[PDB]
Amino acid sequence: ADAKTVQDTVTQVIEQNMNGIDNLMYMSSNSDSTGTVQITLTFESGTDAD
Amino acid sequence: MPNFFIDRPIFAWVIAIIIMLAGGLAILKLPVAQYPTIAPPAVTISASYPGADAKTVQDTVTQVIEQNMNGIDNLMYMSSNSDSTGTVQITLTFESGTDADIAQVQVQNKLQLAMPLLPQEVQQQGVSVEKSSSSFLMVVGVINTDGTMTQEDISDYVAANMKDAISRTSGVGDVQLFGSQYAMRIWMNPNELNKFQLTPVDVITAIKAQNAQVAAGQLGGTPPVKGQQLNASIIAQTRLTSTEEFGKILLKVNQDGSRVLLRDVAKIELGGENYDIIAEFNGQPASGLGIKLATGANALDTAAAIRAELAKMEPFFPSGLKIVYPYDTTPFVKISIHEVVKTLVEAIILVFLVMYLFLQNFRATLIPTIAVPVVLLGTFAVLAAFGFSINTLTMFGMVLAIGLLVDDAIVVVENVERVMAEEGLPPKEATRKSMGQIQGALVGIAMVLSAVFVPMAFFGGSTGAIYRQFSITIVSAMALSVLVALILTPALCATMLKFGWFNRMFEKSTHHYTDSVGGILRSTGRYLVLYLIIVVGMAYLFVRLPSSFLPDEDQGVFMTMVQLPAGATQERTQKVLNEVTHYYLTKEKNNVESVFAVNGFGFAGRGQNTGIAFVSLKDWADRPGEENKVEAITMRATRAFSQIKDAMVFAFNLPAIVELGTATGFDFELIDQAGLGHEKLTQARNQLLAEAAKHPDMLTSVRPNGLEDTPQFKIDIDQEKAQALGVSINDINTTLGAAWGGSYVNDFIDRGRVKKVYVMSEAKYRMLPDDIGDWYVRAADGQMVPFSAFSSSRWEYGSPRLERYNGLPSMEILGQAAPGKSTGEAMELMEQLASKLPTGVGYDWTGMSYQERLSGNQAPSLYAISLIVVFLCLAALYESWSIPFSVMLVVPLGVIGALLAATFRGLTNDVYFQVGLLTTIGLSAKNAILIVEFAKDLMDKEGKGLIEATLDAVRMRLRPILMTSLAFILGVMPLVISTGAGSGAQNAVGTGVMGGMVTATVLAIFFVPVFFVVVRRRFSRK
Ligand SMILES: CN(C)c1ccc(O)c2c1C[C@H]1C[C@H]3[C@H](N(C)C)C(O)=C(C(N)=O)C(=O)[C@@]3(O)C(O)=C1C2=O
């Protein structure tokens, strides 16, 4: 699949659900053209990575 | 310290600044929230199996996943629900400090390995693990005010655009949709399609083929051949995106060239996902959004932030869809913390008035008006220092402690207007002497108050946290108070220090009194005997008084709870819901604001035959008469609703702490323990029940908290007869299923969003048993066959909701204490009634009634240590295994009168009372300690009289007592003891302190000097 067929199908669904996780600072994602997602959540300096 | 601090005065102005400035900085960091956390953590796993039923769902899913909940740390108990709506919910509760975040991982993780053993239809719906916490910050409604949009329509908009919009806003915790999100509804016709010799299977496997999504390579990319020049991505099949495209699905093509589209076999609207729960608000279609806390967010700040984002998207909003607000805690937390804070600003005016009209100044009164708002502000810092939060519990924490910390100021300052008047020295020099008779005695009233307080914060599980809530706050205020009374207060009043309707007038009243003490000091036992009558007072007053948890409160909303009988229907339940909704508007339009009524979700279960009506009221401002408040409206309504034929309809006020324990109730689980079946246990249940009723003396209201067996219609495929024709158990089942129950085929993309595609018989062909006929299945040779050909159906009784406790099948039983009896003894009878139930059956305690069992009585065991640690503490203040014993005897003096919230009102021994009670014992001993001290100072240092010192002691003390004590008994009763506006807890705290304060003073003044003399004389005599 390809961007508008993954960004729609996977990246949203996951992103919809990244609501309210302590010390969230900012999230960023990219779909692909080969079907490949990378959601990244960056947390506040200090926050426990585990 | 202080002596060598009233020399250094501007340093103790710094320390004042930090404390304050630090306390100010915390105010702007502190989480705000109605309550803090108090319920043990709990993880809920829930699943769907469309068209299921309690037994099926239970044996196919619930059992399975239960057999897997092992190797998870800190698990308290595990309960589960399997009900005929095709739904399971397993709820695992944890011990107390269990990290909520780790508890979910473990559960969720241990589930992930049971998944393989679940049925493909369920793995598909997905199973959810998530932290349960029925503490909602609010619930926006989204109605349509044109009638253009339906339930399902409105829900869809709400999902598409605003949902995430909210979910991302300034710390919201979780948003839940009160609706679907459109689903490609394919609504089959058995007849339209028995014609073309087709089943739902043929229909299903088409939807798969036509609505799939294929893959194929690129062009170059993967190793290409030399000097390629183009690289691009092939784009094969991809999902249908319209009701239109779905209509066109090659279902059949026969000799004729016949073209049988899905269109020609069913309706194809774009409806809701599940169709069995009907949300309307003031009579018209509605959808919702229930937002949650957010772990360290600001309840007021995100309350604002929601309304902002809702406004930042109020244009766009089609046709005419209002956003509405049937539930917001915020209002409550506001005009309840806007009070409290008033109590602080006010009980300040008081400790300037009952100070100036007594000392007479503008510079003596300006000192504790600089001291209080510091210890206070500074106390915030200490809260924030242990995570704590601005919240109802912690708020009244301080209010309920203001008297203890005003008395630390007043005491210091006026104990100089003593010293500088006899041998009258200057400021910088008399404060140096006064801060010497009291000095070490505050450092003892500190330790003393550290016990009789800290010993909370140590109580049981659930309700033990509420206690800590007050505990830390008070001990934090209290100790931070002494801390300024040694550092700022003296330094302060040894600087800035040196009406007529008094003075000479108090000057004589001291004398009339001081003499009364004398003489009541010669027999030395006319009053000692009087005391034993007071100690009996309280000791019998104790037992008499009913006990409670937290008194309910007008919160501005309440619930009507409607329940139709056994077989009743959705529509049939709607009719009822309406009357309810009708009654509330037309017949209560002077209190009722709205009726958000949900038709489908009930209490003891779900199903067409149950509902709830959330009703939200007008302002407190606009609901003035006590008969316009809640315990009024509900009382009327509950009666009013006795004109309904079959349809039990209650209305009750929700308890203060929503996500927490309840009535003096016990929670009883009747387990099974052997092969014993559903029925055997149903019988077993029926004994303990019927028995429990024979004893209304030990009181009761015992009751199954579950559902009774219903009839159900069993079809039954004849296996052989099936083989005989060309008919496959699979083709059979699917059809009967998907038609009657609905089946979820796959997904498609609707306006840039993945959404489900369901497939089931139009309602017309799936209602009555006589409707089975309609359905045909294509057999081996290819001839449509009728259901009667391979099956036969009898009616029979089953359970729409089978329940289990800790893996073994349970039936939970609710029940009430007794009008005279203790929650504890109602239990104790129950266990006995249980022990005689037919071999196999067992019981267990859960809920509050477990949080009770495993948290003994404690209070007597804990204060037994406080007490010991007071006598131990108090001896060392003086120097005697005797003298301290005089100070203690004050305990009961505050109790009586405090406990006389039986005679001046009808209330209950509750958490607020209990802490109010402690605040009072606090000033009581404080008095006693300063007295027994003043009597020991000028008796060991001045060698004065075995009785003469005790007369010169209660002389010097009588003035502080009166000042601070009037200060309290006024400002501890502004709207406190007399409210109705988010009140309840207000009257609760205050009343206990008022009457307790009255008796703790108008009585210790005579008794503590008696106490100091009655002791001493017993020791050194033998
Ligand atoms: C009881 N709850 C507060 C409400 C209130 C009003 C509502 O309008 C609704 C709910 C529950 C939710 C649950 C959701 C759930 N989820 C969003 C898929 C869900 O799994 C179901 C289900 N029972 O399978 C729904 O019926 C559901 O679609 C639904 O119809 C609801 C909705 O109609």
**CA dist., res. B649 & res. B178, Å (int):** 23
3-state secondary structure (DSSP) of residue A33:
coil
The residues, ordered by sequence, that sit 6+ positions from B515 with a Cβ below 8 Å of its Cβ are: none
Q: From residue B188, give the alpha-carbon distance in Å to each of B51, B182, B202.
A: 16, 18, 12
Residues B815 and B897 in one domain: no
**CA dist., res. B324 & res. B859, Å (int):** 46
SS3 content of chain A, % helix, strand, coil (to 5): 25, 25, 50
DSSP secondary structure, B860-893, as one string: HHHHHHHHHHHHHHHHHHSS-SSTHHHHHTTHHH
**CA dist., res. B999 & res. B295, Å (int):** 44
Q: B179 CA distance to ligand 1 centroid (A)?
A: 5
Q: Are B628 and B590 contacting, i.e. CB atoms less than 8 angstroms apart?
A: yes
The data reach a resolution, in angstroms, of 3.3
The residues, ordered by sequence, that sit 6+ positions from B558 with a Cβ below 8 Å of its Cβ are: B615, B617, B630, B633, B634, B651, B652, B653, B654
Residues B908 and B992 in one domain: yes
* β-pair partners for B844: B669
Return the amino acid letter for B576.
V
| Any atom of ligand 1 within 6 Å of the Cβ of B51 | no
We report the CATH number of the domain holding residue B262 as 3.30.2090.10
Residue B709 contacts A where some CB pair is shorter than 8 Å = no
- With vertex at residue B310, the alpha carbon angle to CA B304 and CA B311, rounded to the nearest 5 degrees, is 90
We report the CATH number of the domain holding residue B316 as 3.30.70.1320
A19 chain-B contacts, CB cut-off 8 A? 164, 167-168, 172, 174-175
B550: DSSP letter: S
Residues B481 and B407 in one domain: yes
Q: Give the strand pairing for B754-759 and B184-188.
A: parallel
Can you list the alpha helix ranges (DSSP code H) found in B704-852?
719-724, 729-740, 823-834, 848-851
Residues B399 and B440 in one domain: yes
Q: How far is residue B259 CA from its own chain's centroid?
A: 61
Indicate if the alpha-carbon torsion angle B571, B572, B573, B579 is positive or negative.
positive
- Test B233 with A8 for CB contact under 8 angstroms: no
Indicate if the alpha-carbon torsion angle B586, B589, B592, B593 is positive or negative.
positive
Window B:282-341, CB contacts with A under 8 Å: 294-296
| Any atom of ligand 1 within 6 Å of the Cβ of B456 | no
Nearest CA distance, A8 vs chain B (angstrom): 6
Residues B56 and B85 in one domain: yes
Ligand 1 pocket mutation, candidates B177, B324, B612, criterion most atoms within 8 A of CB: B177
Nearest CA distance, B582 vs chain A (angstrom): 38
Q: From residue B235, give the alpha-carbon distance in Å to each of B216, B230, B239, B568, B1004.
A: 7, 15, 12, 52, 92
Q: From residue B352, give the alpha-carbon distance in Å to each of B342, B361, B419, B557, B999.
A: 16, 9, 21, 40, 24
**CA dist., res. B347 & res. B970, Å (int):** 8
**CA dist., res. B933 & res. B441, Å (int):** 7
Q: Are B218 and B748 contacting, i.e. CB atoms less than 8 angstroms apart?
A: no
Return the ligand 1 atom nearest residue B151 CA.
8
Q: How far is residue B34 CA from its own chain's centroid?
A: 9
Return the amino acid letter for B386.
F
Q: How many CB atoms lie within 10 A of CB B316?
A: 9
Q: Which of B164, B291, B293 to mutate to test the interface with A (most CBs of A within 10 A)?
A: B164
Q: Are B102 and B110 contacting, i.e. CB atoms less than 8 angstroms apart?
A: no
Number of Cα atoms under 13 Å in the Cβ half of residue B18: 8
* Residue appearing with tokens 């016709």: B189
DSSP secondary structure, B304-342, as one string: HHHHHHHHTTTTT--TT--EE-S-BSHHHHHTTTTTTHH
Q: How many CB atoms lie within 10 A of CB B823?
A: 17
3-state secondary structure (DSSP) of residue B364:
coil
Q: How far is residue B8 CA from its own chain's centroid?
A: 50
Q: Are B61 and B25 contacting, i.e. CB atoms less than 8 angstroms apart?
A: no
Q: How many CB atoms lie within 10 A of CB B59?
A: 12
Among residues B806, B837, B858, which one ends one of the domains?
A: B806
Structure tokens at B821: 């009896």
**CA dist., res. B200 & res. B776, Å (int):** 10
Torsion of CA B732, B737, B740, B745, to 10 degrees: -120
| Any atom of ligand 1 within 6 Å of the Cβ of B177 | yes
Q: Are B763 and B254 contacting, i.e. CB atoms less than 8 angstroms apart?
A: no
For A20, which of B172, B233, B235 is closest by C-beta distance? B172
- Test A22 with B295 for CB contact under 8 angstroms: yes
We report the CATH number of the domain holding residue B937 as 1.20.1640.10
Q: From residue B522, give the alpha-carbon distance in Å to each of B473, B516, B518.
A: 44, 12, 7
In the PDB record, what is the listed experimental method? Answer: X-ray
Return the amino acid letter for B506.
F
Structure tokens at B360: 């007479």
3-state secondary structure (DSSP) of residue A7:
helix
What is the residue with the minimal CA distance to atom 25 of ligand 1?
A: B274
**CA dist., res. B141 & res. B388, Å (int):** 32
3-state secondary structure (DSSP) of residue B743:
strand
Q: Are B23 and B377 contacting, i.e. CB atoms less than 8 angstroms apart?
A: yes
Query: Residue length, chain B?
Result: 1022
Residues B1004 and B1020 in one domain: yes
Residues B152 and B104 in one domain: no
Q: Which helix (H) or strand (E) holds B905?
A: none
Residues B203 and B295 in one domain: no
The residues, ordered by sequence, that sit 6+ positions from B171 with a Cβ below 8 Å of its Cβ are: A20, B294, B295, B296, B297, B298, B301, B302, B305
Nearest of B680, B668, B667 to residue B843 by alpha carbon: B668
Query: Residue length, chain A?
Result: 50
Would you tell me the crossing angle of helices B462-485 and B911-940 to the nearest 10 degrees?
A: 30
Cα maximum dimension of chain A: 38
Give the range of the structural domain holding residue B565, as residue numbers without chain letter. 555-659
Label residues B336-366 b or e (16+ Cβ within 10 Å = b).
Answer: bbebbeebbebbbebbbebbeebeebeebbb
Nearest CA in chain A to B167: A19
- Test B753 with A5 for CB contact under 8 angstroms: no
**CA dist., res. B461 & res. B42, Å (int):** 14
Window B:157-176, CB contacts with A under 8 Å: 163-164, 167-168, 171-175
Q: Give the strand pairing for A38-43 and B784-786.
A: unpaired
Nearest of B477, B573, B511 to residue B915 by alpha carbon: B477
- Test A33 with B749 for CB contact under 8 angstroms: no
Q: Are B368 and B349 contacting, i.e. CB atoms less than 8 angstroms apart?
A: no
Nearest CA distance, B927 vs chain A (angstrom): 48
We report the CATH number of the domain holding residue B617 as 3.30.70.1430
Nearest of B174, B86, B79 to residue B124 by alpha carbon: B86
Residues B418 and B491 in one domain: yes
Residues B889 and B748 in one domain: no
* Residue appearing with tokens 């300052």: B413
Nearest CA distance, A1 vs chain B (angstrom): 7
Residues B917 and B994 in one domain: yes
- Test A22 with B753 for CB contact under 8 angstroms: no
Structure tokens at B109: 């993780």
Residues B992 and B859 in one domain: yes
Among residues B460, B479, B500, which one ends one of the domains?
A: B500
- Test A20 with B294 for CB contact under 8 angstroms: yes
| Any atom of ligand 1 within 6 Å of the Cβ of B129 | no
Count of structural domains, chain B = 8
Sheet containing B136-142, strands listed edge to edge, beginning at the edge strand earlier in sequence: B175-177, B288-292, B136-142, B323-324
**CA dist., res. B233 & res. B241, Å (int):** 21
Structure tokens at B280: 């309307």
